[PDB]
Structure 1
Amino acid sequence: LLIGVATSSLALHAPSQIVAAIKSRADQLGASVVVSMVERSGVEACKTAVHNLLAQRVSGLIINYPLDDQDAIAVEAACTNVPALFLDVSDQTPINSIIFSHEDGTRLGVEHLVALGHQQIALLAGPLSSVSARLRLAGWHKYLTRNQIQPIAEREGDWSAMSGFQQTMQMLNEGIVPTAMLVANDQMALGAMRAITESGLRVGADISVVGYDDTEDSSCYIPPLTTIKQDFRLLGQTSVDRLLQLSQGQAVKGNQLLPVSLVKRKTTLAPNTQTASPRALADSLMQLARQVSRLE
């Protein structure tokens, strides 16, 4: 009983909250989990990661890493005879896998904003060289389409807070001031939020943001982020588990999806990028002047 976990960059919270979640279930079942982090590169990076664990004489493999249909299949055979469960793959590729409904994920985000009266929605996607990053972009460009609305913007980030921050100062330094944004994860929305703020914009009221994952700090990110949840606590549960099932005789086989949901919090409101004021705002500015000349 020695579960091998070939995971992402543990810098990112998700691949981390997942491992914690894994190590946690293997705990009660009474099995041992052993991590092997895997490089930024791809396919072959993952392969060696795989080989290591194979050497430790692991029992089965949970591959938490981005792979294209083709790559996934490669890696599977790399494992030779050990049963390997895949966590970040197309919900189409043959291999055994557990995926969060990328279809429901986007559908919810999209429809929540539309109902809220938003029309000018901008998209901040993850690193398009990542299947999961790719499948949410798709679902965005579908559920907004079926709703008739079209994305006034589209950026590419990389799962970091800074990435979401730059791509949002960029988008705003050239004229696209929307009323809502669909971000590919919670860290990018964190940065995205500071962005929208250092710009005189009220997050939520002026620009509604909706993260995606609902990692831990998301509750405390200033406006407690309205985010789509991915229960990794329960993803590891089902994972370690099914992994046992495949090895110890049977299985279930191939694609198996889990649900997601809209954790409605505080970054999403009626469009109204604020309307009105006569010379009320003139009277406002007026005082700051006193204040400023109150200084020099």
Structure 2
Amino acid sequence: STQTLGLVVTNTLYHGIYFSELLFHAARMAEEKGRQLLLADGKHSAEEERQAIQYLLDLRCDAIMIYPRFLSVDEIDDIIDAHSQPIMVLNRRLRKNSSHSVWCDHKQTSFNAVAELINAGHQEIAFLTGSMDSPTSIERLAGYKDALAQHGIALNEKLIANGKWTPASGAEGVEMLLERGAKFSALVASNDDMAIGAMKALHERGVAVPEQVSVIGFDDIAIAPYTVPALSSVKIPVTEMIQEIIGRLIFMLDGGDFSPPKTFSGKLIRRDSLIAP
């Protein structure tokens, strides 16, 4: 051991609070356990993310933590197999070395939130995706589909619009949906930023929220109760996920007592933006 902890900086600053919380807690744990915290720049590709892991392995960090934007889960499994130093993965699910990853069931989480809309009487529900290549975005669209299929609703492909996680893309998403004449009493945006953009575009086109269109988001950002109307959103337990990944790492390095690996999912917080049609 070198008494050294590694963290890959990825292009995920501002994409929820995952990275900054990971950073905060990893800094805290490193100081408490008396080890050095090293940063590596993962830059802007899968190869560069791998290089950043490799650089920390070469300097012989006892452990490495990463929330990967480009580097696939399968490639990381291979790196974990090749090295005795634990590589911890946040917000992804590893197939082989699953105890090295802490994840949230974004598919089931989306399902449940869409199911609550159906149970409140919404039959025609629009969906605004995040980025096409985003694992979380793929899972949230899957959960939406799965919820429609299990409640006997036919998949209307007109009701699904592409987004980019940004407020602009949320406004554009509504703009697209209204132009192709899609009809809906509810809209699910894949994050709160897109939802606020969606609500803005709906307001500017004379569509009442929640009276005509109910709106939900994901993230439960601090701003959400203070929108007009107050934004219903799915809270993800990010802090608990971070505490889980740190605790799991402490055990892998130092031992001590064991805690049964938790699984995580979110919950919809109903607010003024969601009613029954």
Normalising by structure 1, we get a TM-score of 0.78
Q: Which runs of 5+ in 1 are unaligned?
A: 272-296
For normalisation by structure 2, the TM-score amounts to 0.83
Return the match for 1:191 from 188, 192, 197.
197
Q: 1:166 aligns with which of 152, 169, 172?
A: 172
2:137 aligned residue (124, 133, 140)? 133
Q: State the 4+ residue runs in structure 1 displaced beyond 6 angstroms.
A: none
1:200 corresponding residue in structure 2: 206
* Partner secondary structure for residue 263 of structure 2: strand
Which of 243, 252, 255 is 1:246 aligned to? 252
Give 2:62's aligned residue: 59
Distance 1:68 1:251 in 2: 32
Q: State whether residues 211 and 226 of structure 1, in contact with CA within 8 Å, keep that contact through their aligned partners in structure 2.
A: yes
Residue 50 (1) aligns with residue 53 (2): yes
1:160 deviation in Å?
1.6
Tell me by how many angstroms 1:101 deviates.
Answer: 2.2
Could you say if the C-alpha distance between residues 40 and 214 of structure 1 is closer, same or farther in structure 2, counting changes exceeding 3 Å? farther
1:63–1:20 Cα change, 3 Å: closer
Contact 2:93 / 2:102 at 8 angstroms: preserved in 1?
Answer: no
Which structure is richer in relative contact order (CA contacts within 8 A, separation 6 or more)? 1
CA distance in 2, matches of 1:194, 1:16: 29
SS at match of 2:165: coil
Cα offset, 1:124, TM superposition: 1.0
Measured in 2, the distance between the counterparts of 1:217 and 1:37 equals 31
1:227 pairs with 2:229 = no
Q: Give 1:27 deviation, angstroms.
A: 7.1
Q: Residue 7 of structure 2 aligns with which residue?
A: 5
Number of paired residues? 269
User: Which amino acid letter does the alignment assign opposite residue 257 of structure 1?
Assistant: T
Residue-by-residue CA offset, 1:79-127 (whole Å, 9 max, x unaligned):
x332111113236453421111224301221111001111110111111
Q: What are structure 2's unaligned runs of at least 5 residues?
A: none
Q: 1:121 to 1:241 in 2, by over 3 A?
A: same
What's the RMSD between the two structures over aligned residues?
Answer: 3.0
Indicate the SS of the match to 1:145. helix
Task: Give the C-alpha shift of residue 143 in structure 1.
Answer: 1.5
Contact 1:25 1:240 in 2 (8 A): no
Answering whether residue 130 of structure 2 is matched by residue 123 of structure 1, we say: no
Report the CA distance between 1:45 and its aligned residue: 2.7
- Distance in 2, Cα, partners of 1:24 & 1:203: 43
What's 1:274 paired with? none
Partners of 1:18 and 1:233 within 8 A in 2: yes
1:146-185 counterparts in 2 under 5 A?
Answer: 146-152=150-156, 153-185=159-191
Gap change, CA 1:184 and 1:45, over 3 Å in 2: farther
